[PDB]
């Protein structure tokens, strides 16, 4: 859409680049909200309303073609990110789901490089990514997420998309969802926005999930028809890793009786281990709390290979068919090596209560506990804070 008059004021976030010899060194980065979360309205004289809702093409009368959509739909800058539940303080990023004015911004943001015009590209095969988190105010049904998508570095800045990454354009993931704009351009044919995605962190205070998602396409692919579906170009399900699903029920939760106690803040380490030819082979997650390393659990379920790490053998044995067919752990790693954009978000799920994260086989939450109508009785103001984002050499971030 056309950038409007209103100025965009991005929150600044200090992050770190780490090596064993040099330790962790500060770097200046900026934070940008998703393009379609900025105010999107019609050009002067066309009346009130936006340019389409999630899941659909843009409206045909303001957008009959890309060129008309590019002048008839306006995307305003956000001068005060706090009005969308997004604030920073030095090395910390606070995401608030619900505000006191009653809105539910549910923010999704990306990490911009120091120029503000290009996303920070992370290349993590053979390296590790680490962060500290406070998950106390995330009850059953909430999802705080921190992940990588293979978005274009400038947000696909182009003739009809002059805003680019400065405005948060170019979102994609492995779900191939239909959005009214893709790469900042009206999505006239209602295609889906597809790309490889590494779900580093999807969690609340009750459960923690990790999952790589492969696609057989490089970068953002605009799919049509069956390309967008389950047997198409991307792996919807991913290769999931959750202590509850592998029958280790005392690892993570609210209380001293769990090895990772979500009543207190903790550190989350994720290592992308490669073979001697440079291809990703294993994904290893462990935690640090109160100055002590907390090793990963090992699997404990009949029919699941004994492992403390994500790998092809584990993914295949747990039924992750599309993950294997669309590239497997090596394919995930090839996307990581090309370069990925960091996304952070906080959201709930009116349709299914986030059951795949923390109910049944996945956690301790009861049927209905995760509904939004019930979340607000437990915690009226859900939020998450991420602090000291840092990445680099194996063994150097913690």
Ligand X SMILES: *[C@@H]1O[C@H](CO)[C@@H](O)[C@H](O)[C@H]1NC(C)=O
Which residues of the chain form contacts with ligand X (CB under 6 A)? 89, 247, 300-302
Closest distance of CB 201 from ligand X, Å: 22
Considering only the C-alpha atoms of the chain, give the largest distance between any 2 of them, rounded to a whole number of Å: 65
Q: What tokens appear for 229 in the block?
A: 């579906």
Q: Which is nearer to ligand X, 93 or 142 (CB)?
A: 93
Closest distance of CB 92 from ligand X, Å: 7
Q: Which is nearer to ligand X, 123 or 301 (CB)?
A: 301
SS3 47: coil
From residue 152, alpha-carbon distances to 38, 69, 342 in Å are 19, 21, 12
Q: Which is nearer to ligand X, 275 or 300 (CB)?
A: 300
Q: What is the DSSP string of 105-136?
A: ---EEEEE-TTSSSBPPB--TTSEEEEEEE-T
Counting every residue, how long is the chain? 398
Closest distance of CB 44 from ligand X, Å: 38
Reference 13, options 106, 145, 111, 154; nearest CA is 111
Is the Cα dihedral 277, 283, 284, 287 positive or negative? positive
Q: Which is nearer to ligand X, 90 or 380 (CB)?
A: 90
Q: Which is nearer to ligand X, 300 or 350 (CB)?
A: 300
Closest distance of CB 12 from ligand X, Å: 13
The whole-angstrom separation of Cα 75 and Cα 69 is: 11
Q: Which is nearer to ligand X, 289 or 388 (CB)?
A: 388
Q: Is 215 exposed, middle or buried (0-12, 13-18, 19+ CB in 10 A)?
A: buried
Q: Which residues contact 291 (CB under 8 A, 6 or more apart)?
A: none
Q: Which is nearer to ligand X, 205 or 243 (CB)?
A: 243
Is the Cα dihedral 216, 219, 224, 229 positive or negative? positive
The whole-angstrom separation of Cα 18 and Cα 34 is: 28
Closest distance of CB 383 from ligand X, Å: 13
Q: What is the DSSP string of 174-236?
A: TT-EE-SEETTEE-TT--EEE--EEEEEEE-SS-EEEEEE-BSSSS-EEE-GGGGSTTSSB-S
Give residue for tokens 């680019």.
164
Closest distance of CB 318 from ligand X, Å: 13
Closest distance of CB 303 from ligand X, Å: 8
Closest distance of CB 256 from ligand X, Å: 19
The whole-angstrom separation of Cα 151 and Cα 1 is: 18
> Which helix or strand (DSSP H or E) is residue 392 part of?
strand 383-392
Closest distance of CB 301 from ligand X, Å: 4
Reference 5, options 41, 48, 31; nearest CA is 41
Q: Which is nearer to ligand X, 25 or 301 (CB)?
A: 301
Closest distance of CB 390 from ligand X, Å: 17
The whole-angstrom separation of Cα 261 and Cα 264 is: 6
Q: Which residues contact 44 (CB under 8 A, 6 or more apart)?
A: none
Q: Which is nearer to ligand X, 89 or 115 (CB)?
A: 89
Q: Which is nearer to ligand X, 127 or 297 (CB)?
A: 297
């Amino acid at each position: 859409q056309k950038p409007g008059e209103t100025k965009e004021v991005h929150p600044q976030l200090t992050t770190f680049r780490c090596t064993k010899r040099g330790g962790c060194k500060p770097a200046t980065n900026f934070i940008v909200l998703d393009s379609l979360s900025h105010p999107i309205h019609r050009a002067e004289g066309l009346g009130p309303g936006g340019c389409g809702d999630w899941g659909n093409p843009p409206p045909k009368d303001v957008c009959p073609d890309v060129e008309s959509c590019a002048k008839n739909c306006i995307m305003e800058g956000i001068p005060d990110y706090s009005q969308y539940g997004v604030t920073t303080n030095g090395t910390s990023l606070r995401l608030q789901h619900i505000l006191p004015d009653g809105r539910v911004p549910s923010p999704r943001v990306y990490l911009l490089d120091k120029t503000k015009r290009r996303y920070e590209m992370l290349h993590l095969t053979g390296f590790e990514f680490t962060f500290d988190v406070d998950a106390t105010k995330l009850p059953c049904g909430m999802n705080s997420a921190l992940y990588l998508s293979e978005m274009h570095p400038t947000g696909a800045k182009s003739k009809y998309n002059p805003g680019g990454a400065y405005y948060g354009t170019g979102y994609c993931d492995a779900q191939c969802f239909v959005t009214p704009f893709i790469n900042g351009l009206g999505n006239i044919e209602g295609k889906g926005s597809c790309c490889n995605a590494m779900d580093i962190w999807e969690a609340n205070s009750r459960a923690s999930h990790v999952a790589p998602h492969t696609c057989n396409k490089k970068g953002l692919y605009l799919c049509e028809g069956e390309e967008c579906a389950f047997e198409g170009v991307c792996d919807k399900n991913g290769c999931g890793w959750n202590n509850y699903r592998v029958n280790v029920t005392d690892y993570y939760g609210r209380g001293e009786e769990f090895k990772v106690n979500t009543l207190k803040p903790f550190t989350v380490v994720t290592q992308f281990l490669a073979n001697r030819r440079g291809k990703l082979e294993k994904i290893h997650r462990f935690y640090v709390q109160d100055g002590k390393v907390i090793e990963s659990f090992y699997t404990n379920k009949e029919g699941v290979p004994y492992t403390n790490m994500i790998d092809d053998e584990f993914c295949e044995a747990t039924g992750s068919r599309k993950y294997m067919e669309l590239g497997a752990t090596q394919g995930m790693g090839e996307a990581l090596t090309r370069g990925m954009v960091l996304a952070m978000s906080i959201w709930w799920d009116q349709g299914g209560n986030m059951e795949w994260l923390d109910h049944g086989e996945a956690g301790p939450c009861a049927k209905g506990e995760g509904a939004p109508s019930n979340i607000v009785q437990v915690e009226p103001f859900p939020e998450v804070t991420y602090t000291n984002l840092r990445w680099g050499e194996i063994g150097s971030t913690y």
